Amino acid sequence: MNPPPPETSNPNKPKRQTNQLQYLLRVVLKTLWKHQFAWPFQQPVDAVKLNLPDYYKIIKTPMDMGTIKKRLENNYYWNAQECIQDFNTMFTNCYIYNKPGDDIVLMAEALEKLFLQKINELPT
Numbered sequence: 001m002n003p004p005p006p007e008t009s010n011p012n013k014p015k016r017q018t019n020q021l022q023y024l025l026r027v028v029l030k031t032l033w034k035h036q037f038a039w040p041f042q043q044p045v046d047a048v049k050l051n052l053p054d055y056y057k058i059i060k061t062p063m064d065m066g067t068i069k070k071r072l073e074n075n076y077y078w079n080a081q082e083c084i085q086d087f088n089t090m091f092t093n094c095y096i097y098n099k100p101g102d103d104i105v106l107m108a109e110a111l112e113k114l115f116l117q118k119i120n121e122l123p124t
């Protein structure tokens, strides 16, 4: 079955808002979220609904944009790099589990290229 989703809150961690984290939520995440290809990435991979019995043997660090969105909304991230790392993990998991040329891989590739375009405009 599925593991519990990644934590989206950490009560022991202090919180702050930064210009880069605001930009990651309001521009980066929002832009990817509305993309034609976003739906498969808007929530944790559900291995029982999608019938993927080996998914969590192969992918031990799941990540998805629904989790990233809640993390941003909950001020879970202290450093903007934490959020960028989660996006990268999401994309890399997709490339590891699936085969090159699969529909989902070409969708991740389009989302990643757009992610990189938006991250390039991150404010100082």
Ligand SMILES: COCCNC(=O)CN1CCN(CCn2c(CCc3ccc(OCCCN(C)C)cc3)nc3cc(-c4c(C)noc4C)ccc32)CC1
Residues within 6 Å of the ligand: 039, 040, 041, 045, 046, 049, 050, 052, 093, 094, 097, 098, 103, 104, 106, 107
């Ligand atoms: C270039 O390409 C052209 C454009 N693409 C297309 O036109 C092709 N299509 C796009 C839409 N896709 C949605 C399908 N999809 C979803 C949608 C959410 C969902 C829907 C139904 C469901 O359960 C009901 C039962 C459903 N059962 C019968 C399938 C549970 C979840 N989440 C996915 C995660 C994964 C994935 C992730 C991420 N990492 O590894 C894997 C595995 C893969 C595919 C996924 C299909 C292909």
